[PDB]
Ligand binder design. Structure first.
Ligand code: GTP
Ligand code: GDP
Ligand code: MG
Lengths: 428, 215, 178, 43, 429, 50, 156, 28, 35
């Protein structure tokens, strides 16, 4: 089989999973109590009485956000000890979640991971959801990755992170947590997707006619992207892509692993009347700089690879026409040492509509995955924000006072300097 | 709750006397398989699917993981640590929906792991029991209605720590003859405590003598 | 006001550490940094201040009187003061030239960090007294990158601990900086 | 096999570390932060 | 889970607590008897934060009422919620301090601190995992400012890794209520600087103006000021008692706000403060919340921004609101006022959004702000103290009670270097 | 209390209200929550006679 | 007693060794080939190798209650042959001082002089009796090819 | 330092003083 | 190093079953790698 384990760490991970697993349950027909009234085998383990248990570990150091899962409509779906809570949260401190609070809860999480991995014969890879700003979503989600990389070896470890937005933010110590977590993203992951909340806010404001959106819509969009990524392990397709088969075509080098997801048809139901959602129309919507999930214009850099993941009523005879149309224009500029630059995956199950959602039911969709050089400018803003504050050592006594040496702040910045140099030099 | 669990353990032993099974073991066969020598006859007991009704119905409980639930160092029902002792003979009693190859695969899995150590003078090291009747749930109890159950009777070297504790807890008291006069006064003499002490010292050294490898 | 200049351009022509430098090598070189000069000042400040019966002039004593206090005159009333817990030292002193040199080398650091330094003097084994141990004094000094060698610590401790009591007043040490 | 010439102290002073890579987007991010920044507009 | 042991020292502390517990019990559905009649199940999920269990399903607060004289606690007991406290928690003596820091710190508080330490050891260890304590007092008095800091000094050594908040009432620039108030202020600030992780500066006529102008009450009471302080103290700890889309406890607000362990004096604020006749003249949205939040007429201190620079600002929101609106309001308020926010910290606003507003309101917000312009409180206190102390104005009522002039000298020098440090961070490249 | 366990006050609770018109409508209940849906309990089937 | 000079502070008693030397008559300094920053010494009961730039000691090897009449190196620094007074010739490693071998009865009195050939095969020694003895050094065995007999006194 | 059967002794980290003394094994 | 949940519970857990009175689930399975 083709099983995957979902690891959801922090408030961002838990609130992302509350939409992800609703989407999965509505895709596979599973009711909120786990009982229908072999396509489910990658996310659900089937106890022999029609009971399907998610392969998910909802992890937090704070007992508030998880307790709504335990008292909500989805209380019977999850195993009671798949939802692990602590006593005190990390309080937006990397040092707390990595050295003080998360050290007493890490091994229970690894125990549940081993429980879930034992039931799965052929494990494809892990799916890790976290955010770079918080404490347990950075410190604990960086200790757990190191433990999993030591223990599980060659298995894929995809991560979907919430990068800090360029202009707006929600905490003051976000650059400190996001700089320190760059080493484990660089070394202890195979594919490191990044999104930021302001880009999805722009998408939900412009492409959807929703003034005043909240985190639920952002989580639903992220769930749609992660459903389209893993859809080829569940339903049949013309050209199925595996979790390994897109990795050999997306990352050129072991250090260049930072794609940018893009879900093309994002329109509400009253704008879908005047739009003919064709394959070519959704294909060139993936290359428009107003739809990237990280605020960076791809025109400032060169595309290096692509993994075009189609879905629904798609025949391979017009994907090539759309690809040729993309290759005609000189705005979309590709790299010297990669002439082909396209991986096409076609599934057949159309995306599902979540009741209460805003996206319209579409027969065609595509998730674009691109390794472009333009993501290197998303690190320069974090670089400037770090050395604006580290110039005279603000907020350092909180991190140093809990088991963290002073010198670890400088090496986490040297790591980002080397990563920036490697990313920017490789396009030219 | 302790008494109810003990009742489940005792009912697992006599399950092959009142129900038909694939590979049944009677009480005389509990004795030529579990007891190597006329003194080493103190085996531990455990119950594998000890789980509440809120968590029983979520995981499938097959043979291959409730066999591991008996060798876990925190599921043993005497406070002796199996990791400082080598097993001599184990008596596995399975009841419910058990097919005899699942037991075989699980026992091979147990014998592949090098942490669970067996003595060199016992290559077989196991006694299988399979019964077809699932354990009976009691209304108002804590255990749940589970279609498989495993009770393991293991004779281990590791029980030599508990008697080394009992000998020290007599060592503390008997040196001042505390509470001895409450025992001498009713048909007992002073020398009978030292008799029990020398017998338990002999039993302590018997475990070391049986536990040492043969060159 | 030019104390770093008159030290950097006096330790280079110093032949061997303690060795001072003769007369005109001072009088002509106070014009190098354009010090206010007068011959009446020069005669006493050279001849009267040659405290070894030689032509060399003690730089360390003179610039010690220039920049480092070590002797307060209370500066009249209605004048705010800084160190408030002094005069707990039982009249100790040797006052070697190397003591003054060590004091001068440590000087630019203490004036920058003495508001937080005094409180880590306090929180480390005070109770309310005003006396710390020598080892704790060395530990507190090192935590603010003041690093003292063995010779430097010998000359420091020979002035603030005469009875070998292993207790050193920290306010009286900090008084000769501000 | 043991030689006296290994009793010679050696350290081989490590070269100074190369200067940190300052990005080519530094001017752009500086102007991006300095835009939309008026003083005393609401308060 | 995460419990808070609440301390109230002095007359000001007791009268603040008598309204704080009323507003908390109304928020958690607790009657004057002590039972539970909540309309929703979310009101009791986190009742262990403030309430301990009793036999028969009764809830008693984790309150320790401290006073040198039991006079104020007759009025506390005779009130509407005075019978919900356990009578063993009331600690009292024989005589009062008489507005003397020295008496309540050395002569009269030294023998009353033991019973309070026993009752807080008993109350603090009946908890699952203690987060922190909480003190309400005033800096101008003798018992609440003298005993109130000895309590923190003793508690901190026993619990060095917990949270110590102090909702202090600081002295008043225009007119006072105590002649010897500068002495008590400069002595209590010297203890509050070392011994606390978070301290809230609350001025009395800031509350008077807020009631008279932003609320437009013709005749207020001290009860209304205590209600304002209770509302601005309940909203800080509202994210660890109710769920929300972004959570922030006391420790998350402490980590995000203080950049150095000395600058922990803050400015409270409560944003939905409508008028008595001008409710219909507004359209309640998040922009009005932000505008009344950051208006300098709405602070709870007589010292102001626009004379200094904001270092860090907190914003704890309550109610069902969108997050793009909150985020864009906090972006606009820093971008459009670029001179009152420091340039070396790229983001100066920490935001937290809970879900349950106070009962009767649709949205709510609670300003907490770390400014470099809190120092004019300390500058004025130092000027008044240097007026009094140089001529021994009232020192004989302190030095005859076992004090020394060196203690006043430490208390002044520490505040003066704190003023200097705030000046150093006021202007920086 | 154990580390990774629910609280006794949260083990038997109804949570918030899914109707937005209620005063105590949580974001989670209005987003992911259904009225008139009673969940079911599981079972285990099988025996050796089978 | 042996020539050490210490400097120890009075607070908490930390000592610092600043000067080391022998404590008897020293003889037969031998320089290694090529390099000049090391040299070796020998005296009563001690054989010490010194750094010559900072005048410090790197190692010492001791055979107690004996005196070393002379030492020599080899062509490459594999051993230090030494001529002790007990009639024995001992070879140590250049560092860690491990005894490589021993020639038990080299002479009827102690060996006085010593030499070394460049091929690391032959060691020439002379005793107080007057015998000049050439010795064969192998990988496993150490033999005596011939004792040459002219001198009527100790070999200097 | 604790004293005995007091609330400061049953604490995550406490040091409890022992009983004072006895009478015998020393001269009267 | 652990290919099975049983070896996760065994070997690398530091919980002594003879001198461990009344530990909970989170402290049985504490690993040497955590320290
Ligand atoms: N997309 C998205 N991001 C979220 C959501 N909730 C929180 N975040 C992000 O998470 C970051 C802060 O970390 P949190 O998730 O709030 O908290 P945490 O990860 O649990 O870490 P601690 O609370 O400090 O222990 C913020 O920068 C947000 O951008 C969400 O629902 N959706
Ligand atoms: N907000 C508020 N302040 C008060 C109250 N009672 C007294 N104060 C203030 O507390 C300050 C002095 O406190 P005080 O009454 O002397 O406390 P005491 O030492 O216990 O007597 C005065 O400036 C008063 O304005 C009250 O009920 N509410
Ligand atoms: Mg959180």
């Amino acid at each position: 089989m083709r099983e995957c384990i979902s690891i959801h760490v922090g408030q961002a991970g838990v609130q992302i999973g509350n939409a992800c697993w609703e989407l999965y349950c509505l895709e596979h027909g599973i009711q909120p109590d786990g009982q229908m009234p072999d396509s489910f085998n990658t996310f659900f383990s089937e106890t022999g009485a029609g009971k399907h248990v998610p392969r998910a570990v909802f992890v937090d150091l704070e007992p508030t956000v998880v307790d709504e899962v335990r008292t909500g409509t989805y209380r019977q779906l999850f195993h009671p000890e798949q939802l692990i809570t602590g006593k005190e949260d990390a309080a937006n401190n990397y040092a707390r979640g990595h050295y003080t609070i998360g050290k007493e809860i890490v091994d229970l999480v690894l125990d549940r991971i081993r429980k879930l991995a034992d039931l799965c014969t052929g494990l494809q890879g892990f799916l890790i959801f976290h955010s770079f700003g918080g404490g347990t979503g950075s410190g604990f989600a960086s200790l757990l990755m190191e433990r999993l990389s030591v223990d599980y070896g060659k298995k894929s470890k995809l991560e979907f992170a919430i990068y800090p937005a360029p202009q707006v933010s929600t905490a003051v110590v976000e650059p400190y947590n996001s700089i320190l977590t760059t080493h484990t993203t660089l070394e202890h992951s195979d594919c490191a997707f990044m999104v930021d909340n302001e880009a999805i806010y722009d998408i939900c404001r412009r492409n959807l006619d929703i003034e005043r959106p909240t985190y639920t819509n952002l989580n639903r969009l992220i769930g749609q992207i992660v459903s389209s990524i893993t859809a080829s392990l569940r339903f049949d397709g013309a050209l199925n892509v595996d979790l390994t088969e897109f990795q050999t075509n997306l990352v050129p080098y072991p250090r260049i692993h930072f794609p940018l997801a893009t879900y093309a048809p994002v329109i509400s139901a009253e704008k879908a009347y005047h739009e003919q959602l064709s394959v070519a129309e959704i294909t060139n919507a993936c290359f428009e700089p107003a739809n990237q999930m990280v605020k960076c214009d791809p025109r400032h850099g060169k595309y290096m690879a692509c993994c075009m993941l189609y879905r629904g009523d798609v025949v391979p005879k017009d994907v090539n026409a759309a690809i040729a149309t993309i290759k005609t224009k000189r705005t979309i500029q590709f790299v010297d040492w990669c002439p082909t630059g396209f991986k096409v995956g076609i599934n057949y199950q159309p995306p599902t509509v979540v009741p209460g959602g805003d996206l319209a039911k579409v027969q065609r969709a595509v998730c674009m995955l691109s390794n472009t050089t333009a993501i290197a400018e998303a690190w320069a803003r974090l670089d400037h924000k770090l050395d604006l504050m580290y110039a005279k050592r603000a907020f350092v006594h909180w991190y140093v006072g809990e088991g963290m040496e002073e010198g670890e702040f400088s090496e986490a910045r040297e790591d980002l300097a080397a990563l920036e140099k490697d990313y920017e030099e490789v396009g030219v | 709750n302790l008494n109810r669990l003990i009742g489940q353990i005792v009912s697992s032993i006599t399950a092959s006397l009142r129900f038909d099974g694939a590979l049944n073991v009677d009480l005389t066969e509990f004795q030529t398989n579990l007891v190597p020598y006329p003194r080493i006859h103190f085996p531990l007991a455990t119950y594998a699917p000890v789980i509440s009704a809120e968590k029983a119905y979520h995981e499938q409980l097959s043979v291959a993981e409730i066999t591991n639930a008996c060798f876990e160092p925190a599921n043993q029902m005497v406070k002796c640590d199996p990791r400082h002792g080598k097993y001599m003979a184990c008596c596995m009693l399975y009841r419910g929906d058990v097919v005899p190859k699942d037991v075989n695969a699980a026992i091979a899995t147990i014998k592949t792991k090098r942490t669970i150590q067996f003595v060199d003078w016992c290559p077989t090291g196991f006694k299988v029991g399979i019964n077809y009747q699932p354990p009976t749930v009691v209304p108002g109890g804590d255990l749940a209605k589970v279609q498989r159950a495993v009770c393991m009777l293991s004779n281990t070297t590791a029980i030599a720590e508990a008697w080394a504790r009992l000998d020290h807890k007599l060592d503390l008291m008997y040196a001042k003859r505390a509470f001895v006069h409450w025992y001498v006064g009713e048909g007992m003499e002073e020398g009978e405590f030292s008799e029990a002490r020398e017998d338990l010292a002999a039993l302590e050294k018997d475990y070391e003598e049986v536990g040492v490898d043969s060159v | 006001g030019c104390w770093r200049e008159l030290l950097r351009e006096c330790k280079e022509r110093d032949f061997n550490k303690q060795g001072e430098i003769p007369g005109p090598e001072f009088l002509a070189l106070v014009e190098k940094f354009n010090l206010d000069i007068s011959r009446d000042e020069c005669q006493q400040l050279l001849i009267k201040y040659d405290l070894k019966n030689n032509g060399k002039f003690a730089y360390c004593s003179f610039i010690q009187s220039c920049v480092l206090l070590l002797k307060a005159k209370e500066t009249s009333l209605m004048q705010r003061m800084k160190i408030q817990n002094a005069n707990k030292m039982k009249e100790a002193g040797a006052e070697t030239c190397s003591f003054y040199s060590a004091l001068l080398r440590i000087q630019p650091k203490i004036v920058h960090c003495w508001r937080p330094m005094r409180r880590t003097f306090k929180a480390y084994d005070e109770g309310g007294t005003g006396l710390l141990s020598v080892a704790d004094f060395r530990k507190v000094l090192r935590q603010y990158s003041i690093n003292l060698s063995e010779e430097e610590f010998f000359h420091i401790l020979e002035y603030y601990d005469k009875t070998l009591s292993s207790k050193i007043s920290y306010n009286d040490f900090l008084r000769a900086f501000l | 096999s043991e030689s006296i010439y290994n009793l010679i102290p050696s350290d081989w002073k490590e070269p100074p570390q190369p200067p940190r890579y300052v990005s080519i987007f530094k001017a752009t991010v500086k102007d991006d932060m300095q835009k939309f920044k008026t003083a005393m507009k609401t308060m | 889970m995460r419990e808070i042991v609440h301390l109230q020292a002095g007359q000001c502390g007791n009268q603040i607590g008598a309204k704080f517990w009323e507003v908390i019990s109304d928020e958690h559905g607790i009657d004057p008897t002590g039972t539970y009649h909540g309309d929703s199940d979310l009101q009791l999920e986190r009742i262990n934060v403030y309430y301990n269990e009793a036999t028969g399903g009764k809830y008693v607060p984790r309150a320790v009422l401290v006073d040198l004289e039991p006079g104020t606690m007759d009025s506390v007991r005779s009130g509407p919620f005075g019978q919900i406290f356990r009578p063993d928690n009331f600690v009292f003596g024989q005589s009062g301090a008489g507005n003397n820091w020295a008496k309540g710190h050395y002569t009269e508080g030294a023998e009353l601190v033991d019973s309070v330490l026993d009752v807080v050891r008993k109350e603090a260890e009946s908890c699952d995992c203690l987060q922190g304590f909480q003190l309400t007092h005033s800096l101008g008095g003798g018992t609440g400012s003298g005993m109130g800091t000895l309590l923190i000094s003793k508690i901190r050594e026993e619990y060095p890794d917990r949270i110590m908040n102090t909702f202090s009432v600081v002295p008043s620039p225009k007119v006072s209520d105590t002649v010897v108030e500068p002495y008590n202020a400069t002595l209590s600030v010297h203890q509050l600087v070392e011994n606390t992780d978070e301290t809230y500066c609350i001025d009395n006529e800031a509350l008077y103006d807020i009631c008279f102008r932003t609320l437009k009450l013709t005749t207020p009471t001290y009860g209304d000021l205590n209600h304002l302080v209770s509302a601005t103290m309940s909203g800080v700890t509202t994210c660890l008692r109710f769920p929300g889309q972004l959570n922030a406890d006391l420790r998350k607000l402490a980590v995000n706000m203080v950049p150095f362990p000395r600058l922990h004096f803050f400015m409270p604020g409560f944003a939905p403060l409508t008028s008595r006749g001008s409710q219909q003249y507004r359209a309640l949205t998040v922009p009005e919340l932000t505008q009344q939040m950051f208006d300098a007429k709405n602070m709870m201190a007589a010292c102001d921004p626009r004379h200094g620079r904001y270092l860090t600002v907190a914003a704890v929101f309550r109610g069902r609101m969108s997050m793009k609106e909150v985020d864009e309001q906090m972006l606009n308020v820093q971008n459009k006022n670029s001179s009152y926010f420091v340039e070396w910290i790229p983001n100066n606003v920490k935001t937290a959004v809970c879900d349950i507003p106070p009962r009767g309101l649709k949205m709510s917000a609670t300003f907490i702000g770390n400014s470099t312009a809190i120092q004019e409180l300390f500058k004025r206190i130092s000027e008044q103290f240097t007026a009094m102390f140089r001529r021994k104005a009232f020192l004989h009522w302190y030095t005859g009670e076992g004090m020394d002039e060196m203690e006043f000298t430490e208390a002044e020098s520490n505040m003066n270097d704190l003023v200097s440090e705030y000046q150093q961070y006021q202007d920086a490249t | 209390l154990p580390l990774g366990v629910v609280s006794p006050y949260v083990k038997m609770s109804s949570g918030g209200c899914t109707d937005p018109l209620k005063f105590y409508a949580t974001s989670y209940c209005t987003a992911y929550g259904r009225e008139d849906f009673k969940p079911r309990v599981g079972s285990h089937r099988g025996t050796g006679y089978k | 007693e042996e020539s050490h000079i210490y400097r120890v502070n009075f607070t908490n008693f930390k000592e610092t060794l600043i000067t080391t030397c022998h404590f008897e008559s020293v003889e037969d300094i031998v320089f290694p080939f090529g390099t000049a920053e090391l040299f070796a010494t020998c005296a009563k009961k001690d054989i010490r190798v010194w750094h010559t730039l900072t005048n410090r000691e790197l190692l010492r090897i001791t055979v107690p209650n004996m005196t070393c009449h002379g030492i020599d190196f080899m062509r490459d620094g594999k051993s230090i042959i030494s001529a002790w007074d007990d009639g024995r010739i001992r070879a140590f490693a250049p560092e860690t001082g491990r005894l490589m071998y021993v020639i038990n009865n080299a002479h009827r009195i102690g060996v006085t002089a010593i030499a070394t050939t460049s091929d690391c095969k032959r060691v020439i020694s002379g005793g107080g009796e007057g015998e000049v003895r050439v010795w064969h050094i192998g990988h496993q065995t150490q033999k005596l090819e011939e004792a040459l007999k002219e001198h009527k006194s100790s070999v200097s | 330092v604790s004293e005995g059967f007091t609330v400061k002794a049953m604490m995550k980290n406490s040091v409890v003083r022992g009983p004072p003394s006895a009478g015998a094994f020393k001269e009267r | 190093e652990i290919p099975k949940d049983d070896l996760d519970f065994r070997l690398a857990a530091l919980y002594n079953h003879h001198t461990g009175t009344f530990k909970n689930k989170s402290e049985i399975l504490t690993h040497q790698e955590t320290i």
